[PDB]
Amino acid sequence: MTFGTLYILPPSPRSAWLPKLAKYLGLEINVKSMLEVEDFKSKFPLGKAPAFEGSDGFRLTETLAIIKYFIDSSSKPEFAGSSLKEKALNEKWLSFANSDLCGAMVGVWFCKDESKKPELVSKLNSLLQYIDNELNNSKFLVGDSVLVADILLYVTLQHIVEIGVDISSFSHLKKYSEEVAKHELLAEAENLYFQG
């Protein structure tokens, strides 16, 4: 049965993160648009997506909050890491990717004005260069295992690429992005069964 209802802003490419994560974890959720709900602000007074309402009525906002609730409510409750340092670095990457990197991708994504684009694409490239460099040291963002940070990074990459930003310049990043797509595929059978 369904874990809850997620309210998104459909035009935003940030709308993909939480649905993907539910899927990855086997949580069945509805997804509605906050634009077409009558009293969004009755339930959610700030008026911003993402917003979630559990089946049980539990109301929750802020992307990082909802990530934690999905994971903690799921059958991979250790998916934001196990050791103290793992958990911390995963928070780091989640916070970074959701604010800075997604903020940059969205800047470009909705760029109407060509006199503003290069500046915006530049912010984005620097952020990618940083990640690339951090991927010098490690197999994935945090270590050797795949954590929720990677899943959501990967989704962000797909969006960045879709709009034609070369990930070709960034060596460690492309190799990363392949290794993550590979882990999900190989993890997919056992994941897909332990939720049915």
Contact assessment for residue 161 and residue 117, using Cβ atoms and an 8 Å cutoff:
no
* Cis, peptide link before residue 10, omega less than 30° from 0: no
For the residues of the chain, what is the DSSP string, one character each?
Answer: ---EEEEE-TTSGGGGHHHHHHHHHT--EEEEEGGG-TTHHHH-TT--S-EEEETT--EEESHHHHHHHHHHTSS-TTTT-SSHHHHHHHHHHHHHIIIIIHHHHHHHHT---TTTHHHHHHHHHHHHHHHHHHTTT-SSSSSSS--HHHHHHHHHHHHHHHTT---SS-HHHHHHHHHHHHHHHHHHHHHHHTT-
Residues with Cβ within 8 Å of 184's Cβ and at least 6 positions away in sequence, in order, are 24, 146, 151, 154
Closest CA to 2 of 53, 68, 49: 53
> Which value in Å is the resolution of this experimental model?
2.5
State the helix-helix crossing angle for 84-96 and 63-72, rounded to 10 degrees: 140
Q: Where in the chain is CATH 1.20.1050.10?
A: 79-183
Q: Which one-letter amino acid corresponds to residue 184?
A: E
CA–CA distance, 80 with 21 (Å, rounded to integer): 12
Q: Assign domain 2-78+184-196 to its CATH architecture.
A: 3-Layer(aba) Sandwich (3.40)
CA–CA distance, 196 with 83 (Å, rounded to integer): 29
Contact assessment for residue 172 and residue 179, using Cβ atoms and an 8 Å cutoff:
no
Q: Where in the chain is CATH 3.40.30.10?
A: 2-78+184-196
* Method by which the coordinates were obtained: X-ray
Q: How far is CA 56 from CA 5, 44, 48, 59, in A?
A: 11, 16, 21, 9
Looking at domain 79-183, its CATH class is mainly alpha
